[PDB]
Paper text:
The γA8EC1–4 crystal structure contained a single molecule in the asymmetric unit, which is engaged with a symmetry mate in an anti-parallel EC2–3-mediated interaction involving the same surface of the molecule as in the other clustered Pcdh trans dimer structures. This crystal also contained a distinct interaction between symmetry-related molecules, also mediated by an anti-parallel EC2–3 interface and with a similar buried surface area. In order to confirm which interface is the biological trans dimerization interface, we generated a number of γA8 arginine mutants separately targeting each of the observed interactions. Only those mutants that targeted the interaction surface in common with other Pcdhs resulted in loss of function in cell aggregation assays. It is this γA8 dimer interaction that is shown in Figure 1A. Remarkably, like the γA1EC1–4 dimer observed between chains C and D, the EC1:EC4 interaction is not formed. However, in the case of γA8 the interaction surfaces of EC1 and EC4 instead make contacts with the EC4 domain of another symmetry-related molecule in the crystal. Since we have not observed molecular species larger than a dimer for Pcdh EC1–4 fragments we believe this alternative EC1:EC4 interaction, as well as the additional EC2:EC3 interaction, to be an artifact of crystallization. The absence of this interaction in some of the γA crystal structures is therefore likely an artifact of crystallization, perhaps due to crystallization condition, although it does imply that the EC1:EC4 interaction is not particularly stable.
Numbering used by the authors: 1 to 416
């Protein structure tokens, strides 16, 4: 029936209550009558101060350990006055003080959310506990800011609270594979204590990105006399998908195209090289289509264009299409004696032909229609001074290194 109050975690020997006044006696009388305390468990932590004539604490008083989460912390002791033969009941309340932070059971948690996870899905979060009760228990859950997540305080009927992370915006690990959040838990008493909990969010990969070539069309020029195996090109295709979902193989699209037989595209490195010799005079252009795939068979498509260059390799060929061999000695300057056809299978300046004959001879070569030539006469001839002629005609293309074919025209001069 003697109520008192005391703060916990207080020093030893702190005043609990003026017992001698509420007993109607002096301190020396308390030390004289032999008034003691009845031997019970909790009463071990209290003691009687005669000089102070009061009630002092003789041990550590932790409410969090003593009464746990009960709403009032009460300790009842019985005081026995022997000479008066009377007994008194003392009820002592212990107040709560915020010396315990909200302690998370787990310091960190990994939440594996898929890349293709739809918004609205919620995942459980680590809970906190505060041995401090009342307003000194947990009161505020503060989640670190993030554009993709929110904090929901779902309350099961039994559980007082249950924090959970809510996915409100879609994710893509191709931009960020892992997130890091700070889950602060604070109790609403002064001084304000708190404790955090780091939450890593691992975004698992989904093969949602297909291989994409750097350029849609690849153009490359090449000489026709390149040795087989020469590195013509090296194609690159990017796949941001993780690991095995990013390993890309390149291959030709067509099924055993002749161009695919002529060339080799390496599967792993994508290096396009020559396999067999290729002549400009057969095909000057090669249009092929290549593709790149990850393991998910996601298709990227591109087109490689190969242009050949006509380096000189074919010499001209002279075809004497006409020859008026019995030449008249009295022929006027300007009469034709032989028509020639010249043809260089090469192209450009490598296919342009020029013809040459000796200077001392009275016969010149003149150009004509459709790369023809005519062997014209411009000076009169002494029949005996020149009876037989073995003319050397040299056809040569204008592409270095020049190629030359020589044809010999046999003729004889006759008179009348
Ligand atoms: C007009 O002249 C050409 C060649 O031009 C002249 O003769 C050469 C020998 C050189 O001195 C040149 O600088 C010169 O301007 C005559 O062509 C020649 O034809 C003969 C046979 O028709 C070739 O003989 C060859 O001999 C070898 C080895 O014996 C054989 O394997 C061959 O099968 C072939 O028989 C000779 O090589 C060839 N000249 C050249 C340079 O190739 C051409 O006959 C002549 N015209 C007339 C009407 O006489
Ligand atoms: C318990 O309470 C009594 C009464 O309130 C206290 O007695 C007072 O002591 C002070 C000491 O300076 C005096 O000035 C007052 O005149 C006293 N009042 C009365 C009514 O006696 C006493 O000191 C307190 N403590 C103990 C151990 O008895
Ligand atoms: C948790 O938050 C409180 C503020 O409410 C801080 O004072 C404390 O140090 C902890 O960071
Ligand atoms: C929240 O963050 C702090 C660092 O500021 C940690 O020390 C704590 O354990 C919790 O993870
Ligand atoms: Ca305490
Ligand atoms: Ca406390
Ligand atoms: Ca607390
Ligand atoms: Ca993606
Ligand atoms: Ca992905
Ligand atoms: Ca991929
Ligand atoms: Ca050629
Ligand atoms: Ca050529
Ligand atoms: Ca040529």
């Amino acid at each position: 029936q003697i109520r008192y109050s005391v703060p916990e975690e207080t020093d030893k020997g702190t005043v609990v209550g003026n017992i001698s006044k509420d007993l109607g006696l002096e301190p020396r009388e308390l030390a004289e009558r032999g008034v003691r305390i009845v031997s019970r468990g909790r009463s071990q932590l209290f003691s009687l101060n005669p000089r102070g004539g009061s009630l002092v604490t003789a041990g550590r008083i932790d409410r969090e350990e003593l009464c746990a989460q009960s709403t009032p912390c009460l300790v009842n002791i019985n005081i026995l006055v022997e000479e008066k033969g009377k007994l008194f009941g003392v009820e002592i309340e212990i107040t709560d003080i915020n010396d315990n932070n909200p302690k998370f059971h787990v310091g960190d948690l990994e939440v594996k959310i898929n890349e293709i996870a739809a918004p609205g899905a919620r995942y459980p979060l680590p809970e906190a506990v505060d041995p401090d009760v009342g307003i000194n228990s947990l009161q505020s859950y503060q989640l670190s800011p993030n554009r993709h997540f929110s904090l929901h305080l779902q309350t099961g009927d039994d559980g007082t609270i249950n924090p959970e992370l809510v996915l409100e915006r879609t994710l893509d690990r191709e931009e960020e594979p892992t997130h890091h959040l700070v889950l602060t838990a604070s109790d609403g008493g002064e001084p304000r204590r708190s404790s955090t909990a780091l939450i890593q969010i691992t975004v698992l990969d989904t093969n949602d990105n297909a291989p994409v070539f750097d350029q849609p069309v690849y153009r490359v020029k090449v000489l026709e006399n390149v040795a087989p195996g020469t590195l013509l090109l090296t194609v690159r295709a990017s796949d941001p998908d993780e690991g095995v979902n990013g390993k890309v193989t390149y291959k030709f699209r067509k099924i055993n195209e002749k161009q695919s037989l002529l060339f080799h595209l390496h599967e792993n490195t994508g290096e396009m090289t020559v396999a067999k010799n290729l002549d400009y005079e057969e095909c000057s252009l090669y249009e092929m289509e290549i593709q790149a795939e990850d393991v998910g068979a996601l298709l990227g498509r591109s087109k490689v264009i190969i242009m050949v260059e006509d380096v000189n390799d074919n010499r001209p060929e002279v075809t004497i299409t006409s020859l008026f061999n019995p030449v008249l000695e009295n022929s006027l300057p300007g009469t034709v004696i032989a028509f020639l056809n010249v043809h260089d299978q090469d192209s450009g300046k490598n296919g342009q032909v020029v013809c040459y004959t000796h200077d001392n001879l009275p016969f010149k070569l003149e150009k004509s229609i459709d790369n023809y030539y005519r062997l014209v006469t411009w000076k009169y001839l002494d029949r005996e001074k020149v009876s037989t002629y073995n003319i050397t005609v040299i056809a040569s293309d204008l592409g270095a290194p020049p190629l030359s074919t020589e044809t010999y025209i046999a003729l004889t001069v006759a008179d009348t």
